[PDB]
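Note to self: the last two entries modelled the partners one at a time, which told us nothing about the interface. This time every component goes in together.
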Amino acid sequence: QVRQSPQSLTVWEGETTILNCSYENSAFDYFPWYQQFPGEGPALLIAIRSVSDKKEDGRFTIFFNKREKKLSLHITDSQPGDSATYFCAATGANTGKLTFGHGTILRVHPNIQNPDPAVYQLRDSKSSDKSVCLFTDFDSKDSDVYITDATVLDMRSMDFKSNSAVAWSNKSDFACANAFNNSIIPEDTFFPS
Amino acid sequence: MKVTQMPRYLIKRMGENVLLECGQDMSHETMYWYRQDPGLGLQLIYISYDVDSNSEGDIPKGYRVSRKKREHFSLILDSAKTNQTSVYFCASSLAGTGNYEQYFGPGTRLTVTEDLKNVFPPEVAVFEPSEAEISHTQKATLVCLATGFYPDHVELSWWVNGKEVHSGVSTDPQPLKEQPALNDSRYSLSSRLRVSATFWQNPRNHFRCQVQFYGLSENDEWTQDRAKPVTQIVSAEAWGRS
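The predicted structure of the combined assembly is written out below.
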């Protein structure tokens, strides 16, 4: 068993990401981390040996603590392009194959230079009752922005990569104020008519 | 130096034979088949250490493997089950121990479905930018919604004036179930394209969101009244407006 925590993590550009791992087999002696970008296969990123307590490669650093059988990957100065799933893996002289942890999903929001939280309703270019609410800078947890009744009759999707969220409906009575928890969203959220 | 996989997308009915293929040009001795499922990690199905030297991984049940050339490694499901819906990755390394870097293919997303009548192409709609956004920011965000599709095998792109664009595009990372509580739920995906207010305001400009859907093939039988959900593109287009 190789165990990672957390299952997923959301960070801001610039912040230090810390990814935790632990292992039960004290016969593990080699610990590579694999990085998997969206829609791609995993790729070897950085590895350390049991004989060593710290491995550095630019922005990426594995600290390794043999005794508590714990290690962690640090990414200083996190970049949007670091958004990926990170797998901690382990093997020893006397363990077959390579043993992967279940991975940590990392999402890095790009920095927001001038926050403009705003909600706009957009009409379908083709004649219908359909509309979309577009929430710019909605994050200036993320999904708490949404009303998830039971009432709204909508569908919802957030884009961590552009700091935006949408919600949409086929109901012509649909209004963007009822899609969102106004108590929780950014304080200066603009709702132009 | 690359690992290749074919096909990239697959939709099969339960009980069918399925063949996944992996190539590799690095003269690597060892090859691997993994599957990747939500929450679980990379799970090893079979490892191959030399031609006809295949060894079980942790989850070999329901799978068979073929290594007749050093450059290829085949994964076979003799009778596909719905719980074999997954993303399959092959890999290779120089020799078979864990100490060697594994090079992974780009993946095959396989969906095994109880009945092909569950397969639906997407509907696509483009939403015109809000005038309130244009007034406030001098920029105009179009939104594309791809809805109602199954399986979640799509690629969305934007075409402006007949050319694919990437600049100012942000697409949802993955399709989302419309009804997360249903195994056979259909999916939606959204995307935004942001341009300047003057670019949107030019009635000469046109903006097409295109979704490539990967669906049924010629081998698949179809008797339904509705159109056969084959691999196809579905688009929606809007024109700039003074």
